[PDB]
Amino acid sequence: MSYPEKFEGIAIQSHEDWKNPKKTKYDPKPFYDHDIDIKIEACGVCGSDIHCAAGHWGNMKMPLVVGHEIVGKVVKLGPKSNSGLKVGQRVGVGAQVFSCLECDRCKNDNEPYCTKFVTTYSQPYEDGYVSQGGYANYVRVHEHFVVPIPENIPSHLAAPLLCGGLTVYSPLVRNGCGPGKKVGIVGLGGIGSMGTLISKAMGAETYVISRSSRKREDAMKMGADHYIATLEEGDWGEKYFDTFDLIVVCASSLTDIDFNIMPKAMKVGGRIVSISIPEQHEMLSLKPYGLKAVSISYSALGSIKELNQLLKLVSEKDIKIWVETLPVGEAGVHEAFERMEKGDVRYRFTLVGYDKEFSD
Amino acid sequence: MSYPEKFEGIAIQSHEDWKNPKKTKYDPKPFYDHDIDIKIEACGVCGSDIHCAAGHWGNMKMPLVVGHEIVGKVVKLGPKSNSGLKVGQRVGVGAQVFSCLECDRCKNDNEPYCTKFVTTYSQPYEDGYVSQGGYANYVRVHEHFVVPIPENIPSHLAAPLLCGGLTVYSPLVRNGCGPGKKVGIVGLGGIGSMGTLISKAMGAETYVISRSSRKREDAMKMGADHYIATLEEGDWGEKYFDTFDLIVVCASSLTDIDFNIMPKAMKVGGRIVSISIPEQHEMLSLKPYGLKAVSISYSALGSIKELNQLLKLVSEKDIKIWVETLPVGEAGVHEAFERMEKGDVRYRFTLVGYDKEFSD
Ligand SMILES: [Zn+2]
Ligand SMILES: [Zn+2]
Ligand SMILES: [Zn+2]
Ligand SMILES: [Zn+2]
Questions:
Q1: Residue B102 C-alpha to ligand 4 middle, in angstroms?
Q2: DSSP classification of residue B136
Q3: Residue A21: CB partners within 8 Å, gap ≥ 6?
Q4: Name one GO biological process term (chains A, B).
Q5: Which of A268, A277, A296 would best serve as a mutation to test chain B binding (most B beta carbons within 10 A)?
Q6: CB contact under 8 A, B298 and A296
């Protein structure tokens, strides 16, 4: 039925047919004093969306509404709200929808790494409800995770930042991506793109590192000071020896990426940071010997503090990311999905046209 | 014969009988304009010494004089010397005996990571000679790697710093080991000890992390604010969850050290740094998933700049390391070796009594 009691959205019915989501009606999460209800109007299709649906993460309780690069308007503030959000205000939600907010890690701004962390969708809250939202009309989120969206940034062009962009940003900021640093982006995909842009925006000689050359042109349109085609190198680590300060590996899987060569290209003290989460059956594997004065680590999402920093940056220096809009709906999602697997996206798919798909 | 033309020392004759070195006479490295000849009077027995001799590193050209925690006196400066060393001066030499000194990494103070790096022993120079020195009367080293040894630091108590100590120091300094930081030392062995001391000396709440409790008493005598016995924990990473900033793993091998638990105990941004080099057939193996906001890397020796920093620190705050002297000679080395394998050392063995073992 109408808003209040029931939410509607394009939802997965079975991992078996994850490519065919059907519009569905479901009960929202119980509303809490700090929660906020946001009427959605745009949602970036995140690679994670695809892996989840396909069940690459495991068997998830269905039905299931995916999507977590949300940009909608505030349509109802809970009793104890104090974040300073007004009703009808333009807001965003990313991958995190809950945290404890009391631990050291939260107070210290590392909510993605909280003991009691909960993700936007597919995860049951401490009370049982399995997080939904995304490819739907409304999403119910705790105010700490809802953010203001700068005026100049358009919805379809902001949403992707709530997750993908943030994901690249966090490690880039945290590891000094800035003036005079040499940064490599491994995998000019959805997240790969924003990182390439975000990276430059920060003033770092950005190198884009892909396999073929299919994307050389784009990487360069994006402002990448350099591009590297692995298949055309034999030993790129050898050629680019001692050049990088930081390399953020953001690629769907971690198979076609030899991790015994990469270190060579890192400066003493260099850092390789992966943004990936592949089909569980996968593991990041590399020869130990090589981590000689070069560290390797993994990163998850970012802290809302940073999510804000990014939005601001994307806003202040007019960062135009590459998005191709699709119409929300059993179809749009389908295409969206279909294509994302084929890798047939000009980097980011932002679902829109929410207004004319759910009605009243 | 006498000094000039031939050097003498206790040398390995075959990996097969690496425990029975025999006093030997061998031709020094050709003398070069910056080289320096140091008459040895003390040399710390380094774990590396043991692995090399045993052939854990591979088949090495024999005879072979091991030892690279050298402390002797300057007995001959080469033509172009300018380091400012005087003759008869007290000096030290560690594991590095050569570098290019022109590359970025050298000028930038990372000579251990130089393209043309050469180690004190077992390595042929760009000209062919296989680096010796250590358990001998004289060692011939390029001035860049010979260092002044503070007055107050006794020889047998300084030598171990030239390698072991430096090895722990480097990563500790480089990763902020200091006031208000929580640091863990994994493996209270030779290097483990100095690190425990050095660490405290710098003002870091030092935790010592070993297997049994056999060393609890010592670790505490050393000033360790805490001690942890793995075998008595079941899940120490769980108990010490989110506590460490840095952990330096300095243990002979890397087998009895589960690396899927350690990350848990690291703070977001924490760092695990190994100092180990095990019997080649070995590899540092751990579940990928865990490097969540925690990085893992490896480190080699230190930069002479740091080697100096350490000597200074050990000197200014009177750091007494744990050394048990032995008499250089077919015997002393034997015992030294024998014991080091059994692990029967109160941390560091410093060979001495060089004066009365080689004569004229
Ligand atoms: Zn995501
Ligand atoms: Zn928390
Ligand atoms: Zn050594
Ligand atoms: Zn060099």
A1: 6
A2: B
A3: A10, A11, A12, A13, A53, A66, A135, A330, A333, A334, A337
A4: alcohol metabolic process
A5: A268
A6: no
